[PDB]
Design an enzyme around this catalytic site. Sequence first.
Site, PDB file in Angstrom:
ATOM      1  N   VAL A 121     117.052  81.779  24.703  1.00  0.00           N
ATOM      2  CA  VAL A 121     117.484  80.436  24.347  1.00  0.00           C
ATOM      3  C   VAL A 121     116.272  79.515  24.431  1.00  0.00           C
ATOM      4  O   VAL A 121     115.226  79.908  24.940  1.00  0.00           O
ATOM      5  CB  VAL A 121     118.633  79.960  25.259  1.00  0.00           C
ATOM      6  CG1 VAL A 121     119.249  78.680  24.724  1.00  0.00           C
ATOM      7  CG2 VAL A 121     119.696  81.048  25.386  1.00  0.00           C
ATOM      8  N   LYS A 122     116.412  78.293  23.937  1.00  0.00           N
ATOM      9  CA  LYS A 122     115.528  77.195  23.831  1.00  0.00           C
ATOM     10  C   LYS A 122     116.579  76.101  24.118  1.00  0.00           C
ATOM     11  O   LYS A 122     117.703  75.793  23.914  1.00  0.00           O
ATOM     12  CB  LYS A 122     114.843  77.056  22.470  1.00  0.00           C
ATOM     13  CG  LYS A 122     113.490  77.764  22.449  1.00  0.00           C
ATOM     14  CD  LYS A 122     112.999  77.897  21.005  1.00  0.00           C
ATOM     15  CE  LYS A 122     112.707  76.517  20.412  1.00  0.00           C
ATOM     16  NZ  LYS A 122     111.894  76.610  19.206  1.00  0.00           N
ATOM     17  N   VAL A 123     115.927  75.273  24.931  1.00  0.00           N
ATOM     18  CA  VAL A 123     116.589  74.148  25.583  1.00  0.00           C
ATOM     19  C   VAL A 123     115.599  73.003  25.765  1.00  0.00           C
ATOM     20  O   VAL A 123     114.584  73.175  26.437  1.00  0.00           O
ATOM     21  CB  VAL A 123     117.183  74.558  26.950  1.00  0.00           C
ATOM     22  CG1 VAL A 123     117.857  73.370  27.615  1.00  0.00           C
ATOM     23  CG2 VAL A 123     118.166  75.708  26.797  1.00  0.00           C
ATOM     24  N   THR A 181     112.443  79.993  16.406  1.00  0.00           N
ATOM     25  CA  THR A 181     113.104  79.072  15.494  1.00  0.00           C
ATOM     26  C   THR A 181     113.541  77.823  16.246  1.00  0.00           C
ATOM     27  O   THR A 181     113.755  77.843  17.460  1.00  0.00           O
ATOM     28  CB  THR A 181     114.323  79.718  14.819  1.00  0.00           C
ATOM     29  OG1 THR A 181     115.432  79.717  15.725  1.00  0.00           O
ATOM     30  CG2 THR A 181     114.017  81.147  14.403  1.00  0.00           C
ATOM     31  N   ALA A 193     116.176  80.970  19.848  1.00  0.00           N
ATOM     32  CA  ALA A 193     117.068  80.041  19.175  1.00  0.00           C
ATOM     33  C   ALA A 193     117.330  78.858  20.092  1.00  0.00           C
ATOM     34  O   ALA A 193     117.377  79.005  21.316  1.00  0.00           O
ATOM     35  CB  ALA A 193     118.391  80.707  18.784  1.00  0.00           C
TER      36      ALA A 193
END
EC number: 4.1.2.-
Lengths: 220, 220, 220, 220, 220, 220, 220, 220, 220
Positions: free
Chosen positions: H84-86, H27, H58
Amino acid sequence: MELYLDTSDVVAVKALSRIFPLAGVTTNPSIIAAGKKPLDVVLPQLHEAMGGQGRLFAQVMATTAEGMVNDALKLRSIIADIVVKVPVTAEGLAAIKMLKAEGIPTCGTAVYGAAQGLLSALAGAEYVGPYVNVIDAQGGSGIQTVTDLHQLLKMHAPQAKVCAAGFKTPRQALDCLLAGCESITLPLDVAQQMISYPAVDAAVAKFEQDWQGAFGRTSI
Amino acid sequence: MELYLDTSDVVAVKALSRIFPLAGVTTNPSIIAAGKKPLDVVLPQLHEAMGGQGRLFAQVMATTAEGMVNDALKLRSIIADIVVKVPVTAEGLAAIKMLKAEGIPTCGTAVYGAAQGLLSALAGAEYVGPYVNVIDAQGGSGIQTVTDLHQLLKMHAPQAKVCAAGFKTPRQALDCLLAGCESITLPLDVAQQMISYPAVDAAVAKFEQDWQGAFGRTSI
Amino acid sequence: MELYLDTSDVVAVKALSRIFPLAGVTTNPSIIAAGKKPLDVVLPQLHEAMGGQGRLFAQVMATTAEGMVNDALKLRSIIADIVVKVPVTAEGLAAIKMLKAEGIPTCGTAVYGAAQGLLSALAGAEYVGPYVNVIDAQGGSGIQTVTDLHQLLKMHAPQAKVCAAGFKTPRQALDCLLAGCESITLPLDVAQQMISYPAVDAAVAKFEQDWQGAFGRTSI
Amino acid sequence: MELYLDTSDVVAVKALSRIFPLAGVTTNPSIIAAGKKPLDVVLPQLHEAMGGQGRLFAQVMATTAEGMVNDALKLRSIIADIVVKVPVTAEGLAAIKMLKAEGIPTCGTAVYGAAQGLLSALAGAEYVGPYVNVIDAQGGSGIQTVTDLHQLLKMHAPQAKVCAAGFKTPRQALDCLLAGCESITLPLDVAQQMISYPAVDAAVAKFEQDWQGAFGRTSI
Amino acid sequence: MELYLDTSDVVAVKALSRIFPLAGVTTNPSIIAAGKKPLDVVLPQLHEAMGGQGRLFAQVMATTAEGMVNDALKLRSIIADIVVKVPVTAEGLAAIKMLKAEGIPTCGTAVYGAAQGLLSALAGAEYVGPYVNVIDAQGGSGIQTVTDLHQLLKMHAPQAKVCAAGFKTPRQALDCLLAGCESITLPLDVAQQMISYPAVDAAVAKFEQDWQGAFGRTSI
Amino acid sequence: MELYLDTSDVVAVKALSRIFPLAGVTTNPSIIAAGKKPLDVVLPQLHEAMGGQGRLFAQVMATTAEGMVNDALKLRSIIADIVVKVPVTAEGLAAIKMLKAEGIPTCGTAVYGAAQGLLSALAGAEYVGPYVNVIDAQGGSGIQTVTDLHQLLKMHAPQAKVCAAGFKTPRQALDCLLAGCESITLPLDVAQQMISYPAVDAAVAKFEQDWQGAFGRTSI
Amino acid sequence: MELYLDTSDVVAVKALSRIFPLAGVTTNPSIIAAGKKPLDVVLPQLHEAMGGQGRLFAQVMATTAEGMVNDALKLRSIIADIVVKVPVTAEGLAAIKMLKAEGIPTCGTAVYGAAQGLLSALAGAEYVGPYVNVIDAQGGSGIQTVTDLHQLLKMHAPQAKVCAAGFKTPRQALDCLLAGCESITLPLDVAQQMISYPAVDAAVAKFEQDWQGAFGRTSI
Amino acid sequence: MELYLDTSDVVAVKALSRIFPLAGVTTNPSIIAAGKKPLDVVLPQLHEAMGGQGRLFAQVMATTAEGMVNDALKLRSIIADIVVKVPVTAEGLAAIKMLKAEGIPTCGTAVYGAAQGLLSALAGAEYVGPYVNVIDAQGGSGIQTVTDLHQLLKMHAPQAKVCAAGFKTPRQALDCLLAGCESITLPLDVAQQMISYPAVDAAVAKFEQDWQGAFGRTSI
Amino acid sequence: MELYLDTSDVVAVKALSRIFPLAGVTTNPSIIAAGKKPLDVVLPQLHEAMGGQGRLFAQVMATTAEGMVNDALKLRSIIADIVVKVPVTAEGLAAIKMLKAEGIPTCGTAVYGAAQGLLSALAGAEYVGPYVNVIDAQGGSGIQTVTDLHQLLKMHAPQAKVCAAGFKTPRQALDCLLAGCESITLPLDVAQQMISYPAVDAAVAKFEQDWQGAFGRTSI
């Protein structure tokens, strides 16, 4: 990679031994004749010039395989760990086979084709020496022959190495090395060319000039 | 790499056994007929000429698979460790399967395509023999067929090897070897051509001439 | 494309002239010696065997350039429209230059490298004949040399052609032709091999068998 | 491009003549035998089926070159503008040469190699027919042979064309066309496969469904 | 290169006609159905939106070749210079042949393979339309099919052009154009994406900011 | 490499089991229908024909994933070690996942693209079956799809294998094998073609003729 | 090849005009702002610095297409033969179309993709300017984009040229030129780097030193 | 290979989880906004839809590295094993470094170049997410960037994987996978397209039709 | 992979140490002079800026090999684990050899050719630093030289690494990394360019805008 010198010049060998990471000194009958001194005299001198270490190459004089074996025994007597050089002929191949049976390291010299070098390697030769310049002067391509020979040795005689020789320019040595050659022997002129760059001297001078400008001295 | 001789010439095999690193001698019914002597007489002679070692190849003459197996048993009786040769046909494939079940080493001969050679290798053959000259004379490309067969054997039947035959020139053998062929069998003319180089003789003569000029002798 | 015959066999040339679209017959001193008859006798016979047309090649025997020119004049006297052959040497290049100045067509023979052939073509040679088998037996690659020579001739001497010679197999001739060679000369064995296919005979037999089955007759 | 049909089926030729942009109909003795009717009957029927236009191919049946020329004359009598077919043999090459001298168009059939096809083209054949399926079933590569033949014809005999035949799948025809073949002959099964796509029918049905949904009718 | 729009949106066609160098507008029955208006009403509107110039494409809806010809005549009556679209089927190929005989330009649509498109082009079609998206969604490669079709058209039917359609991303259109396609038709989304770049807007803003900083205004 | 037979012909399977190194027999509903006998009758017969060993493939007939699982259980009941075949659909992928969870080997059939085959392999399928002929007849390239699928399986699903099917010529099978396919299934016609070479028969006849000429007999 | 300067520096343009074979001077709003003088003042000065010849480039500042046309008219009033620059946007493409209709030469600037540049060229632009450094800083490949754009222009808009800009190193300019770009614009730093080689100075010094050593002077 | 879904649709994720071998759900803030529900609500729902297993992604929303770490901690609190997404910025790289020091798995999103992705991977990111569609729409090549990034990760950061996203067509996903990408995330449209093939439905229908014809029923 | 900084700016090194995964800081006499502070002051500051970890590079200033060794000892006294830098000259190679004998890590700087770098690596250098920009500004290709040097090191001196330096654009660093370089050092400008992308900022802004639109806040 093993880096050898294709000369019998003892003074030059000593001078370049402390600069180059030399693996040995390699000689042929023409080089020895140019040196004007015999094997029993040159070989100890060349070995000493390398610091008592390294690996020496000498070539046999006989034409018959038994004569080549006798010359190999003489060379081994002169230098305990010398690597013979043997032209890749019918008698040369026979002599290589006998030396392999005798435990003496052998090198296939006078190689003009990939198949000839592969035959020498299969006979028992540890090294196979094609002369790039001679093959180029024979109308063929020395680099292509060396590449084919290296591929054949790697895929068929993995225990053998290619020691490319006969370089007129450092670019030939670079091309041979990029082909994967496990060893290379350079003449004095080519070897000196490989390390002499005017651009490096200019860059060092510029670095020193900046050092003087920012500090006013040259050391440290 | 295994280097075989495609001949039934005992004298020539003996002469070339001390020069080449031969892995054996290979024969087919045409070669045997040219030799004019039977298998029970030739095969012992060829084995002796090789020094009592090496690996001999002989071909079956039956057409039915059971007849091929019987001929293979006869050949194994004549020579204990012989490697049969079997044409890659339906009956040939059946015979290869039976010989594999029987522990006898088999070789797939009369191979004209890569897929046929792969079928022979999968049946149980240790060697697959494509004739480069015959394939070339059939309008195709012998080198391309050999390369395809070797790739198929390496990626599908890793236990099988390619023994390329039918060479008119040493360049064909060099091309086959560069394709990765694990084995090669040369006729006497091609094998002799692989080691005879006039340039090598000229270089040796020049080396001896320099030796005489600088020392005044020929030996050592 | 010009298809020549590398032979002095008058009977075979006559036999193959009605089969092949021959552009001429090519001869060298070794071929003539094998023929056992002099040029003044062979050349008229070879010209007649070709039907009075075509283009003959003969090679000079002198070593000096002036002697080469004299031999060229003698050959032109024997055959009005003959194409000389001249080895590509220093004296050979000089003779090629003089023949070009004299309007006599010349051919650069004894070509072992692409650059030597290009020099011969620039001197004035109409053809440049590299022997593929000789170069292959010299440790190099005959096909690669021929390809390089053809590229050089096309991009530097567009008026010159490559007449590839020295073939042991039809595959060599096919490779040379696929490289773009404008001309090719074949020995009798290779020329005969290029037209003899057992598969063609089998196909024709099958066609005739179907014709008999459907009609019961062989003709029409 | 010239698109031919490899059949003697008159009804199928008539049916497919209004669909395909046929350049002619091509026949061989096996096809004619399958047709069960003679040339003097089939050939007029095939010409009529094409609408009185097109270019017919018929194959000779004699083995000698003179008999081949006689059969070619008979075929030309039956059909004024027929293109003969002649197997590429020694007698076949001779007959091709005679037909070229006589002004009769000729086609080199039974071609198994690129060199054989080039020989046929140089002899005078306007078309050279390699059978892809036969070459593939002979252990070689039909597409590679066709590509080599086309390259040779284009760079050596620009007046000749390649008429690839012997297709089992439309992909073979596509590969031959992508190789540059100036002509192609398809059998009925392959030719029908080239135009029958279920996806096209589905797309047309979807178009009609959308037309009905937006308008309520199928026409216009 | 001819740039067409794959739409029946009159307002969007008018909006994009002044931006793009459009060569025309292209439609299919699904697009027309989405437009909800008939050909006699849409085609004049699309022609007017293009400024009275350009080249319109419309697709026949009949299944029989004669019905396709009648639909082509109706379309030509509606628009004098329209280019029909005809699925490449057996009846489609027949209709293409009849339209070529009648002088009406035709386009081969519903093309799923290079060979089918080549057949359509040989039948007489001026354009051949492969749908990249449909071919990609059929498990194949639309770009590869388009490249093969373009090569075939250029080397076999030089009078025919490829009008690649069915683009989901501008990258597909770029790949088709780099393959050499002489024509391309884009949908509204893809066409708009081809000209909308945020980077261009940012660069223009930076240029205006520098202009204001150095001068204090925005114009000139 | 696993070599399977794409047939339900028990007699032919028995005949070819002793010739080919068959790994099993592969079937689909069309093949079974052509066989005219049910699975509970055919599969035991095919297993017996293969000698009581090998690996059989059977295809589910349900449309829902649960129905496919039930059909897989039925097939496993008929043959203990059978490898199911399951079309790669949404329900097909679900059924593959359930069978993987259930420990039943599964095969992804009806594969038309590399991505679909990779999805089937990731779901749990041990084999992925693309039909080369169907893909080729769908306008795409079957060999390219098979190569892409094999590459994807090797780098992403190393536990899965490609079982290429749908061959019209042995060249297609050779191309698939050269692409690296770990498995291949041949129809009876193609499989018989791979081993029948007239050249092999001619060579064997020549060998026997030489044997008779030199010895006067045929055996040994 | 047209070599432009990407600067508004009048003194440097005059200095480099007598060294480089400049085809003109190219400017953008950022460059003009850095120059701190208006177009009506800079452009005459830049034209004079080039010797009254060459081809100047100036960029419009309006956002609407009509405003861009008005700015182009103003620029043409300032310089009679100026080549406008216009960002490739929707309004930019419209303005390019109007300028083409008006006979004013236009240049497509702010080009970030090959397709955008091709659209600008098709609209009527004579030059298409991709900024290599900007594209490289956008995460893409400036050289690849320039190569694609040049190929598209050559095969689709043969009347358009690529004027690659945005170079940080002379190697970028060399790569762009080797891609076939018909024009190139260099900044002052890169342009100066292209001609300043310390090695050239060293070689000239060595030549003069040898001249002095052999003759004792410096001239002649 | 890890196959993810680029969606926040819980119902669609549940529906496709039993079909696809999903490794997780991915997402981004735009996707979540389209979902209209917060992370603390969506993420448990998406995890439950996958059956309580899989790996969720996310994206953080803070701009500072410390805020990014705080958002990562919040996400880990919501889902224990979330990845995580960064975005790969300066602050993004700092946050990736801190998360690696903290043991939280991180993913480098908003990757537009290979160098940026490699920087993210070296900082500590386990996954590097380039959007193929966004890069393609930025004027570059998404597939080339993805291939370069994968090569860089494999040869420099072997512990990192490429999770290619932004696919408009299944062909883009196939190209990314063939480049060697260890992971891929598909949107619902592309995921559904990858499994829906009308040809498969037609083949299944044909199989059932043959089964009915030969037996008269549908089951078993 | 090791990522170094080619600067002596302590503040910038501290700022970028928390962003980049720096493996160290690299300095040369020109960089140090630009720093205006001595080694005994800069080196502790640079080490502290990296957090007390990392790997510093400093360059000797002597011209004689013994002086080079003395400078290396001084540098090691200043920083315990420093990696010296030594120009690859004759005296440079000698100093490299002595430092290898002394256990001090060394780096071969001022490398202008692949062979010179290989000589430095063989002599004992752990790193070989070619300056891409300096080689590019010498008429050659820095990327090609770096690729050749890396290949030579990998196949001949596997214990040595290439630390490419002298980058003007991030694309040069990307090309060097794609060539396989095990290490890279970037100047501050190039390093900053590698992480600053306006597209990433725009994407983050769009994500936040969607977040506000769907939720009405910015956090979480």
